[PDB]
Design brief:
It is classed as chaperone. The structure is cut from a larger assembly and holds chains A (526 residues), B (98 residues), C (532 residues), D (528 residues), E (93 residues) and F (155 residues). With 98 residues, chain B is mainly α. Chain B contains four helices and two strands; from the N terminus they run ββαααα. Chain B has helices at residues 19-24, 31-46, 51-71, 75-92, and strands spanning 3-7, 13-16. In chain B, strand 1 and strand 2 (13-16) form a beta hairpin. Chain C has 532 residues and is of the alpha+beta class. Helices cover 46% and strands 15% of the residues of chain C. Chain C is built from 17 helices and 19 strands. Chain C has a four-stranded antiparallel beta sheet, with helices on one face. A three-stranded antiparallel beta sheet of chain C has the order 4-17-18. A three-stranded mixed beta sheet of chain C has the order 7-16-8, covered by helices on one side. In chain C, strand 11, helix 8 (257-276) and strand 12 (282-285) form a beta-alpha-beta unit. Chain E is 31% helix and 14% strand. Chain E contains five helices and two strands; from the N terminus they run H-H-H-E-E-H-H. In chain E, strands 1-2 form a two-stranded antiparallel ribbon. The radius of gyration of chain E is 21 Å and the shape is elongated. Chain F is mainly alpha-helical and 155 residues long. Chain F has helices at residues 29-47, 73-78, 85-100, 107-123, 129-149, and strands at residues 58-61, 67-70. In chain F, strand 1 and strand 2 form a beta hairpin. The longest helix of chain F has 21 residues, at 129-149. Classes of the chains: A alpha+beta (526), B mainly alpha (98), C alpha+beta (532), D alpha+beta (528), E alpha+beta (93), F mainly alpha (155). Strand 21 (515-520) of chain A pairs parallel with strand 2 (39-43) of chain C. The structure holds adenosine-5'-diphosphate (3 copies) and magnesium ion (5 copies). One adenosine-5'-diphosphate binds at residues 37-39, 41, 59, 89-93, 154, 157-158, 406-407, 447, 476-478, 491, 493 of chain A. One magnesium ion (MG) binds next to loops of chain B.
């Protein structure tokens, strides 16, 4: 009956209402995780739709479990994920900053200022923020292990693992240092692939350690295999050690009596030939990503060789990195180079009620396994998240050795510098510039709020202190609510984290400011 | 100011720019907005003009109070400051008669 | 009487309905025109968000029902395909033309006369643009390309960043330049592989002096970087050999099965040995590579990439000088791989971009290529950046191909309106009204810009019209033809000197397409909608 | 937007603000205008509207058509209301006001779309309307002689011009003369209720007549009525408000007797009361007895025995008209029926008109009222004839008030448009565009006339503009000759009050529509 | 199904209210768990009353294996996206 | 060609003008005239068979089942249960003829039907309907004058 231009379910709204809704949604997203910032933050309990429980105080972990309908909140969640993936830290800070800049932009949008002017002012302020951050930074001697440990500690004082700080810092530093690789003139760290974190519930957290090798959840295929080898020689394979069909259709035609027996004998002889090819290199351990036949097990064991089968490809790559081996598909092409010498011990021991394979005495290994042992699964997941944050911070510092004062000192200094710069523009865009400059004070403000101290008095004192000459390192003590210089407290952040936080927050503000129309309801049309 | 076409629940069409009439014909449901509407109607009853001034001033005061609470003040401090400033304004006002 | 199973609309009803649909489509995108325009949020009722300013994208995503609105949507799509810019201006102009023509028709002017007047006005507008309002780019230099790119990227997510993005776009376009027969320098846009990755700010977007692959090595064993690369491009998979459909293996003697199974992989072993015996370092193939061939590449210290896209492989082969080999078969019935079938690059590195890796083929020889990595805050921002960047690349290609540009900011529209209003008195007796209405409809662009800027549209357009009228009446005031609009300050400005340019082809094609669409919709006077 | 756990207004409240809602309001006004677009001019067409219950109304009057439409758009209802106001104040121009207002809004729509402040448009409308009203008052033609023949001809021409768009336009001279004759016999107040209109089914239009007196339908005669003579040559009329029948003396009256003699005395007393009233009426000398209250069968037979005429249950307005025409007085008490409270008329007669009996009171030299007896083929035919006669009557009354006339057919609109364009060409320019738009919108009436006549509107408008530019105040559309002509010399005359009110109402409606920026629709209550 | 859709991009898991379709009383009383599988425009899997064969708080792997029991399951991570006329490239000619 | 003007907006917001405008039909211009002419033609062609000495009776049944065999045109049309408004107009025409004269209540219907049938082909040629009505009125005046001329008096 009715005739329409667009579809019936296509709903469109535009005007000041859309901007107000976007800014309100961003402020709501910021308020969700506002109290999860600082050393005195409180954890949150998240219930998964699958029935699982996430108990954490990380910005990205909290935000990725929230389902929202407003596309502005979806944008903010994507911002959180981007910050988490790019640098690994500052996830709550970027969300809070984006919310604050969007609020101070809404203030101007209420008046008759076009959003494009606000966006231009925001971009200019972002450039000046980058300049100030690069100016107030300090170098770091990466050789000094104590300084690196202090940096990691300052990174993890705000997490639940802070009670065991020396252990976690040493674990992260050792893992990052020994996963470092440099081949063909290319330097890589690769925390994602190598340096796997394996968590086993039970035990005590102080028993956790980083292994000089790789531990996998596998057991020997046969009981008579040796479960403890002093200096094993390890061979890694992809192809199965069992007789398998070919690709082509290869039906046989048996007419003589002995052909069936001959086929079976040839299958056994092929298995024996593969095992002899393996044995010719004189190894002690054979690891296969696929199955190993029982006859293959017998032939390997006749040469006193421990065999483990059905290992994941990632685990095999990690073992190859750790023990200096090379994965070989066809056993007949095995060479002396492919055999992995360098493992200093291999042991299959029992933890709880399950067997675990340890290769934990490698000399100069390029891969490691972090063995987490805690109260339960959720505690171990939180510990793993905190360790990931620490390792990301360590890698960021190693790539860029620049350092920046923490606890809001850098932000207050940048805000003061930007205000002093704005004292000379004498234009019409100076007001958004100064507003977004002062919007950086939200994180010192929320630090004070979480500490429980008086926000107004402490913020006024800090702002007055930053007006002096050499006071760029004066911040707020997160757990006592006092103004302390951060060359004494020692809280410092990598420059990369701060740069990424500012850039991402300002660009999120720009992206959500450039929008004044929302159309929804149309089908994907695909 | 621009006239507003307001249609109440009884298909009675009001076009006007009088704040008190617009508030009267609007089905306001929020208790705080109800309180501000009551204040505007009291202003209309006492004087007869100035309802829009009352509404605008109350809205601006509450927005700035929200800002003050956000920066770190307390509700009691904001209320006391508003009362002192209102007394000062009432003192200044007779001197502004031309 | 008719007994037709459906609805029927006749006369002013259907014409008004068509004009309403066109006006609704125009008003959808009218708010995203000019530098003071703003983007739109589009949600597809599944949770996917598309923040965009492109008129073609907005009209494509929306699901539309009315046929005239569909006509306008396809008009925007055609303008996007044939030009790449002005997808919103063409739709707005077409809708305004339709509205004014329908007003004339409702004034008892026959639609045939309106169509004839519109056609004459379009011809005269194109002729006037090509005769008076074009500026040759020969004497301007690279500044003209930079300004055209900046103008194209205005009103986009990369607006204020134009000072850097315009240089990046111009460098990429000049890099992908090639010449062909008839002595024509042709610029094949879409050869610039646009890669998106959230992370650092827009300033960290990189222009690769080579090619960028959204692919990684097939196995962790191979080195991640090769200095003196010898790229070998292949179009076939490297897997265990399998007999074809018409060949079947039947065994009667048990002794031959092992030999059969061994050669089944020895074939691929021999092929890989033949490929690697000529010194190849990087091997790119469209097909898959299984584990055994990957290990063959690992032992030789090569770089093997599988499942490479066909267009990416073709671009890499063309830039590096390699020849794509679908098979290792020569004209002598043998299996050979000559050294001449190898590409050359100065470096092949697998870089890391925000917890992800991509392959950079840097500084290829025998041909210069280009690729762009766009760094944003999230996926939506990256997609909008890619769309705006494609618009800028198309504009730069248009400016480089045809060496004529016209001033922006509604200057050409105002000059055309004045000239056509003057000219309508010299043609016809009843189609002169159609020409005058065409001229009046041409003024919808500066009006929309002024409205989006929230300025005095009436007074600003009156000033612009007065300037152009003085230019067209006084011979000595030809320098006033470039007076356009300065939206930031809300005052008329000499746009040619201010650096606001756009290709002439954009305006000409938009005018022609809008006129044709208005003519097509104007012919309809009776609609029959059969019941499904 | 945000869910906002507790919300401001009640759920279902719809608010539309900004330029889009104003454009939608202008579009709604256009939609209302096109409903009555084809009813304007001598070539106009009637419209048929069926209500919910199935009754059909056929009308050419713009106000009636707009009222029958169930308009609910808040901005569109303004056009209906101003049409009602035009009908109330003047009675003619109901179609012109809506067209003028909608054309104003349509002409200022393009400036609204481009962000022009509505206050400027309102000021321009006010200035243009004031200038146009002053021009109309200045150029309106009046005759300073008060010659009875001249006023008669002026009123007849105005009535003919008013009537020459309805289904009775063929007999417009006959009806116009009859209307002028009817109006001139009203004394000073020109009350509509003093002009009765009777609709009798069956008969040609020319069979309709004007009675120099009063006429009304026969009202439920009792037994013995047919004995009464139905024609008198100099009757005296006893106008009464009295119930002449046996009944209880009072509602609360009660009779208490204890003797049969008192019973008979009470019965005889009731009969003697009735006969005393009847005898007083008879001795008054009257021959025609009219009573607002019912007259019983006993009184009917009593009057039949005396060769008298009786008619009870007469409608009250008909008795008022009879008193005004014949010149008696309505009496509630028959105790003093003096010679000055009895009406006089030359001829009273009961005649059959189209299957109905109507009492006639003609030959009244001192008559101050009339009675239209309209003959038609159906209910709607007679109703539309009555509506056209009402339009003509209101026009004639207004012309009696002041004999200021202007030429119709768009001549006055062309003159006003030319004057407004000349004025607008001498101002800085922000108001110039809006006043020019106003002047162009004033051209709708001749264009609509040409469109309704199946003309070529553009050529006629060009010729009229060229004529008015070089001289000639009263040149308008000539429908018969497919050309333009001097409408003043063609006796296409309209009172200047009609156009003055039309311009004023259209301007006020346009300003009211433009001045609105937001529309709020509260959720309905008690939908059931 | 959320986890399956996350892992499997090909399949088109969708949900719909039982009452919206308009099932009978028997369906609404003893047939709430219904797995409707479409392939080729026609049904190939019509599981109903799956609580006994699955449980009440079963995991993703349990239902995945249950669906795999009848062969119902058809057989890298990009940065964000890659897909950007037909003019590709030429050289000198 | 119905439902008034079905647009519902120019922008997208609701556009409601007349109450229940989605349940109301509308006919305009020549189509309405064609429908009216066809309806009147149907009524007149039904009624013309009962004309003259050889005319045949019509046998009405009311809503209660009562039977009324009649030849009176006014009676036939009065008892007819019509819904079209033009048919009601023709019924009222017959009632008017019966009231004023009492005879010839069938000839009026046939005459009106023939007049509208001719007006149909006249409108098909582009003549404005008001011109047709004016010509009909002029010809009716001529016919009435001729009837007065050829009239004969009786005692
Ligand atoms: N001891 C401390 N005193 C004051 N501020 C601190 C201290 N430790 C950390 N911070 C501040 O807390 C912030 C870290 O908060 P965190 O919970 O990690 O949020 P995010 O993940 O967004 O960085 C850093 O910016 C740092 O400046
Ligand atoms: N700096 C500028 N100053 C004035 N006008 C501009 C400027 N940049 C672009 N414009 C104008 O804005 C108009 C809108 O362009 P835009 O809508 O962004 O392109 P598209 O129509 O392809 O989306 C163009 O016609 C152009 O002339
Ligand atoms: N004889 C005529 N010739 C030309 N135009 C006429 C004639 N009579 C009336 N008009 C025009 O018809 C218009 C009024 O039409 P009508 O429907 O009768 O009243 P309304 O003003 O209510 O529409 C006036 O504007 C007048 O100019
Ligand atoms: Mg942190
Ligand atoms: Mg006031
Ligand atoms: Mg563009
Ligand atoms: Mg009239
Ligand atoms: Mg007869």
């Amino acid at each position: 009956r009715p005739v329409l231009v667009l579809s019936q379910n296509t709903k469109r709204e535009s005007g000041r209402k859309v901007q107000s809704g976007n800014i309100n949604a961003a402020k709501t997203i910021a308020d969700i995780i506002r109290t999860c910032l600082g050393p005195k933050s409180m954890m949150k309990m998240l219930l998964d739709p699958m029935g699982g429980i996430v108990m954490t105080n990380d910005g990205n972990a909290i935000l990725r479990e929230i389902q929202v309908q407003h596309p502005a909140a979806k944008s903010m969640i994507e911002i959180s994920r981007t910050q988490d993936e790019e640098v690994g830290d500052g996830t709550t800070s970027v969300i809070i900053l984006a919310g604050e800049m969007l609020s101070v932009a809404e203030h101007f949008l209420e008046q008759q200022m076009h959003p494009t002017v606000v966006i231009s002012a925001y971009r200019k302020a972002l450039d000046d923020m980058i300049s100030t951050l690069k100016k107030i930074s300090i170098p770091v001697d990466i050789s000094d292990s104590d300084m690196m440990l202090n940096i990691i500690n300052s990174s993890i004082t705000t997490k639940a693992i802070s009670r065991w700080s020396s252990l976690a810092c040493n674990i992260a530093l050792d893992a990052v240092k020994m996963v470092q690789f440099e081949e063909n003139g290319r330097k890589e760290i690769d925390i994602k692939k190598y340096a796997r974190v394996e968590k086993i519930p039970g035990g005590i957290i102080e028993d956790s350690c980083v292994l000089r090798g790789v531990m996998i959840n596998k057991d020997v295929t046969h009981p008579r295999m040796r479960r403890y080898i002093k200096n094993p020689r390890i061979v890694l394979l992809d192809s199965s050690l069992e007789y398998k069909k070919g690709e082509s259709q290869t039906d046989i035609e048996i007419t003589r009596e002995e052909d069936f027996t001959r086929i079976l004998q040839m299958e056994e002889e092929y298995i024996q030939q593969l095992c002899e090819d393996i044995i010719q290199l004189k190894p002690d351990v054979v690891i296969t990503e696929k199955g190993i036949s029982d006859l293959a097990q017998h032939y390997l064991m006749r040469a006193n060789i421990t065999a483990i089968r059905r290992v994941r490809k990632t685990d095999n790559n990690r073992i190859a990195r750790a023990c200096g081996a090379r994965i070989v598909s066809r056993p007949e092409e095995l060479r002396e180079d492919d055999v992995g010498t360098g493992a200093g011990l291999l042991e299959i021991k029992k933890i709880g009620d399950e067997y675990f394979t340890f290769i934990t005495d490698c000399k100069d290994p390029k891969a490691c396994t972090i063995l987490l042992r805690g109260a339960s699964k959720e505690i171990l997941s939180e510990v793993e998240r905190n360790l990931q944050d620490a390792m990301q911070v360590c890698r960021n510092v190693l790539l860029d050795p620049q350092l920046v004062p923490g606890g809001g000192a850098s932000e207050m200094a940048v805000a003061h510098a930007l205000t002093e710069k704005s004292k000379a523009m004498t234009g019409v865009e100076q007001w958004p510039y100064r507003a977004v400059a002062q919007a950086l004070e939200v994180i010192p403000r929320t630090l004070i709020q979480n500490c429980g101290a008086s926000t107004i008095r402490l913020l006024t004192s800090l702002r007055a202190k930053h007006t002096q000459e050499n006071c760029e390192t004066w911040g707020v003590n997160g757990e006592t609510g006092t103004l302390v210089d951060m060359k004494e407290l020692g809280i410092w952040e990598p420059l990369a984290v701060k740069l990424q936080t500012y850039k991402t927050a300002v660009e999120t503000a720009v992206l959500l400011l450039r929008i004044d129309d929302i159309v929804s309801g149309h089908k994907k049309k695909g | 100011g621009m006239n507003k076409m307001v249609i109440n629940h009884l298909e009675k069409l009001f076009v006007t720019n009088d704040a008190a009439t617009i508030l009267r014909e609007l089905e306001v449901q929020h208790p705080a907005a109800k309180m501000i509407v009551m204040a505007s109607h009291m202003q209309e009853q006492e004087v007869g003009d100035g309802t829009n001034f009352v509404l605008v001033f109350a809205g601006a005061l509450l927005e700035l109070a929200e800002e003050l609470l956000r920066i770190g003040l307390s509700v009691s401090e904001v209320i006391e400051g508003y009362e002192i400033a209102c007394r000062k304004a009432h003192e200044i006002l007779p001197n502004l008669v031309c | 009487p008719l007994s037709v199973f459906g609805d029927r609309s006749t006369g002013e009803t259907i014409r008004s309905q068509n004009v309403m649909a066109a006006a609704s489509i125009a008003n959808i995108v009218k708010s995203s025109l000019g530098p003071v325009g703003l983007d739109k949020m589009l949600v597809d009722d599944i949770g996917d968000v598309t923040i965009t300013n492109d008129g073609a994208t907005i009209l494509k995503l929306l699901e539309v029902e009315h046929p005239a609105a569909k006509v306008l949507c396809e008009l925007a799509d055609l303008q996007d395909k044939e030009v790449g810019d002005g997808t919103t201006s063409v739709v707005i102009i077409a809708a305004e033309l339709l509205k004014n023509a329908d007003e004339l028709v409702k004034q008892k002017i026959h639609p045939t006369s309106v169509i004839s007047g519109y056609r004459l006005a379009c011809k005269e507008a194109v002729r006037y643009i090509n005769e008076n309002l074009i500026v040759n780019t020969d004497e301007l230099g690279r500044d003209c390309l930079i300004n055209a790119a900046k103008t194209s990227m205005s009103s986009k997510i990369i607006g204020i960043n134009g000072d850097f993005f315009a240089n990046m776009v111009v460098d990429a376009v000049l890099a992908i330049k090639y010449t062909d027969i008839r002595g024509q320098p042709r610029y094949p846009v879409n050869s610039v592989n646009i890669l998106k990755a959230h992370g650092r700010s827009q300033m960290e977007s990189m222009l690769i002096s080579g090619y960028a692959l959204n692919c990684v090595v097939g196995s962790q064993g191979m080195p991640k970087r090769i200095v003196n690369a010898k790229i070998a491009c292949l179009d076939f998979s490297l897997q265990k050999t399998k007999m074809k459909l018409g060949v079947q293996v039947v065994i009667t003697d048990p002794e031959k099965l092992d030999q059969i199974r061994q050669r089944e992989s020895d074939i691929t072993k021999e092929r890989i040995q033949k490929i690697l015996a000529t010194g190849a370092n990087v091997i790119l193939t469209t097909g898959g590579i299984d584990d055994m061939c990957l290990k063959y590449f690992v032992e030789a210290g090569a770089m093997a990439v599988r499942r490479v896209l066909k267009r990416d492989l073709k671009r890499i082969a063309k830039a590096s000088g390699a020849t794509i080999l679908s098979t290792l078969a020569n004209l002598e019935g043998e299996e050979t791989f000559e050294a001449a079938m190898l590409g050359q690059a100065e470096e092949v590195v697998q870089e890391r971009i925000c917890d992800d890796e991509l392959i950079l083929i840097k500084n290829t020889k025998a041909r210069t290529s280009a690729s762009i990595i766009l760094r944003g805050a999230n996926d939506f921002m990256c997609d909008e950046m890619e769309r705006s960047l494609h618009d800028a690349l198309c504009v730069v290609k248009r400016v480089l191909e045809s060496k004529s540009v016209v001033p922006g900011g509604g200057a050409v529209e105002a000059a055309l309106s004045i000239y056509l209003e003057n000219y309508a008195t010299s043609m016809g007796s009843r189609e002169q009204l159609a020409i005058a209405e065409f001229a009046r409809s041409l003024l919808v662009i500066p009006n929309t810009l002024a409205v989006n800027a929230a300025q005095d549209s009436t007074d600003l357009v009156a000033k612009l019209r007065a300037f152009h009228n003085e230019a067209q009446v006084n011979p000595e005031r030809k320098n006033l033809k470039w007076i356009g609009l300065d939206l930031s300050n809300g005052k008329p400005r000499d746009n040619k000197q201010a650096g606001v340019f756009e290709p002439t082809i954009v305006k000409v094609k938009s005018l022609k397409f809008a006129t044709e669409a208005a003519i097509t919709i104007l012919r309809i006077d009776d609609l029959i909608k059969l019941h499904p | 937007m945000m869910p906002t756990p507790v919300i401001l207004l009640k759920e279902g409240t719809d608010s539309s603000q900004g330029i889009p809602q104003l454009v939608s309001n202008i579009s709604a006004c256009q939609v209302i205008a096109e409903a009555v677009r084809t009813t304007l001019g001598p070539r106009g067409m009637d419209k048929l509207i069926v209500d919910g219950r199935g009754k059909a109304t056929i009308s050419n009057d713009g106000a009636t058509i707009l009222k029958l439409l169930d308009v609910v758009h808040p901005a569109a209802k303004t056009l209906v209301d101003i049409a009602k106001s035009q009908d109330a104040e003047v009675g003619d121009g109901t179609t012109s006001v809506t067209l003028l207002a909608a054309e104003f809004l349509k002409q200022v729509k393009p400036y609204v779309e481009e962000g022009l402040h509505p206050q400027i448009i309102i000021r321009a409308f006010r200035t243009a309307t004031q200038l146009a009203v002053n021009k109309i008052k200045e150029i309106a033609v009046t005759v300073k002689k008060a010659d009875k023949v001249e006023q008669r001809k002026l009123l007849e021409k105005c009535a003919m011009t008013a009537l020459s768009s309805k289904l009775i336009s063929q007999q417009k001279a006959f009806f116009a003369k009859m209307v002028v004759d009817a109006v001139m016999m009203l004394d000073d107040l020109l009350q509509l209720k003093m002009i009765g209109i009777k609709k009798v089914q069956g008969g040609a239009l020319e069979d309709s007549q004007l009675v120099a007196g009063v006429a009304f339908k026969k009202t439920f005669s009792y037994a013995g009525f047919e004995m009464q003579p139905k024609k008198y040559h100099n009757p005296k009329i006893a106008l009464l408000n009295v119930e002449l029948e046996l009944k209880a003396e009072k509602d609360n009256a009660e009779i208490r007797v204890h003797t049969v003699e008192d019973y008979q005395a009470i019965v005889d007393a009731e009969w003697n009361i009735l006969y005393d009233k009847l005898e007083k009426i008879h001795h008054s000398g009257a021959k025609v007895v009219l009573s607002k209250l019912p007259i019983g069968d006993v009184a009917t037979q009593y009057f039949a025995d005396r060769d008298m005429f009786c008619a009870g249950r007469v409608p009250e307005e008909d008795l008022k008209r009879t008193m005004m025409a014949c010149g008696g007085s309505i009496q509630t008490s028959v105790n003093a029926l003096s010679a000055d409270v009895l009406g006089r008329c030359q001829v009273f007669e009961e005649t059959q008109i189209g299957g109905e009996r109507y009492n006639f009171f003609t030959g009244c030299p001192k008559a101050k009222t009339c009675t239209f007896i309209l003959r038609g083929g159906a209910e709607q035919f007679m109703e539309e004839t009555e509506r056209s006669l009402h339009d003509a009557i209101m026009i004639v009354r207004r012309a009696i008030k002041n004999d200021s006339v202007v030429a119709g057919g768009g001549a006055i609109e062309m003159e006003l448009s030319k004057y407004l364009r000349d004025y607008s060409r001498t101002i800085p320019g922000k108001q110039q565009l809006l006043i020019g738009a106003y002047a162009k919108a004033l051209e709708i009436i001749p264009r609509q006339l040409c469109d309704n006549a199946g003309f070529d509107a553009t050529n006629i408008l060009n010729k009229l503009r060229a004529r008015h530019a070089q001289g000639g105040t009263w040149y308008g559309v000539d429908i018969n000759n497919e050309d333009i002509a001097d409408n003043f010399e063609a006796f296409v005359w309209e009172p200047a009050m009609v156009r003055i009110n039309a311009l004023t109402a259209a301007s006020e409606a346009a300003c009211l529509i433009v001045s609105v920026d937001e529309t709020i629709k509260n959720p309905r209550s008690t939908v059931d | 199904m959320i986890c399956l859709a996350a892992e499997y991009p090909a399949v088109k898991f969708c949900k719909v209210k039982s009452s919206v379709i308009g099932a009978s009383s028997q369906f609404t009383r003893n047939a709430l768990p219904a797995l409707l599988i479409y392939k080729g425009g026609e049904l190939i899997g019509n599981f109903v009353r799956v609580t006994d064969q699955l449980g009440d708080d079963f995991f993703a792997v349990d239902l995945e294996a249950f669906l795999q029991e009848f062969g119902l399951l058809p057989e890298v991570l990009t940065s964000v996206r890659n897909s950007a006329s037909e003019d590709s490239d030429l050289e000198i000619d | 060609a119905s439902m008034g003007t079905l647009a519902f907006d120019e922008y997208g917001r609701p556009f409601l003008i007349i109450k229940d405008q989605d349940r109301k039909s509308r006919l305009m211009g020549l189509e309405a005239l064609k429908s009216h002419i066809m309806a009147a033609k149907a009524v007149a062609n039904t009624m013309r068979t009962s004309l003259g000495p050889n005319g045949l009776d019509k046998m009405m049944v009311d809503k209660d089942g009562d039977v009324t065999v009649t030849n009176d045109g006014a009676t036939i049309l009065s008892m007819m249960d019509v819904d079209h408004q033009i048919a009601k107009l023709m019924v009222e025409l017959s009632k008017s003829q019966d009231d004023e004269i009492g005879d010839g209540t069938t000839g009026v219907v046939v005459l009106a039907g023939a007049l509208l049938e001719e007006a149909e082909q006249l409108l098909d040629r582009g003549i404005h309907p008001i011109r047709i009505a004016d010509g009909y009125e002029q010809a009716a005046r001529v016919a009435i004058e001729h009837l007065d001329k050829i009239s004969d008096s009786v005692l």
